Amino acid sequence: PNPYERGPDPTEDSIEAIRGPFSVATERVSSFASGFGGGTIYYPRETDEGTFGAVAVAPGFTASQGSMSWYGERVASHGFIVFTIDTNTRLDAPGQRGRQLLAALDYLVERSDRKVRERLDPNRLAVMGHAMGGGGSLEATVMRPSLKASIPLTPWHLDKTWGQVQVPTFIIGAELDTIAPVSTHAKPFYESLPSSLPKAYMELCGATHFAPNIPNTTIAKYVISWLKRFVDEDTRYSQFLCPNPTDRAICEYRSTCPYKLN
């Protein structure tokens, strides 16, 4: 059996639920932490199923952790440590945001309070971010190729080539976004990732740039499924990812399914 499985066998209803099966606690991290602007760690309270993987979550240009706060309880309650960070400055660029995502992960591994550290599997780490923070998610996977997953949400980056990334990457685009338009950001990034990388692209019908900053069940269910599949190696979640989702909220989906269990 896979020792990283947590929680009951999933259903489409259970991955859409606002509160997953774990209760959640928080730990605040001061902005004086090294290499990033501090943040909030959301973690599952229950320990008897084992330790958990972690995802560091970055905001976009001129945004702060509050724009990403809803991921904390939503995702942690399905069995993840979720660290919503602030950046060094509000004006930081995608490369800087990638470096800071890594600094936040290293803080979890090396410096976090014992309540977090005792719940963490330091070998199973992921990144996620919105807009320039999604560019940061891409960057972080080049800077740290041992990451288990990357989730660029309506990502923004001037560099359109990501052909050496080896970290499973799930890009979410917003159909009507004019700040990080999918035609020039999300889709080029997706198509530039290796054809043989486990990857997906989900475009949300009607959505605008700030769609990832408020609760969105279509985002949540597939973010949870991606993190389960890749951070936890949990093939009970393959059923939601492959074949491609058909939810009405989705206007286009691309993938490299099947994601062979490796």
- The residues binding Ca ion (CB under 5 A) are 33
| Minimum CB distance to Ca ion smaller for 34 or for 123 | 34
| Minimum CB distance to Ca ion smaller for 28 or for 248 | 28
Shortest distance in whole angstroms from residue 33 CB to Ca ion: 5
Shortest distance in whole angstroms from residue 126 CB to Ca ion: 21
Question: Which of these, 50, 77, 88, 92, lies nearest to 224 by C-alpha position?
Answer: 77
Shortest distance in whole angstroms from residue 36 CB to Ca ion: 6
3-class secondary-structure state, position 33: coil
CA dist 149 and 135 (Å) reads: 14
CA dist 188 and 172 (Å) reads: 12
| Minimum CB distance to Ca ion smaller for 88 or for 192 | 88
DSSP 122: E
First-to-last CA distance in the chain?
14
Shortest distance in whole angstroms from residue 99 CB to Ca ion: 12
| Minimum CB distance to Ca ion smaller for 33 or for 41 | 33
Radius of gyration of the chain (CA): 16
3-class secondary-structure state, position 253: strand
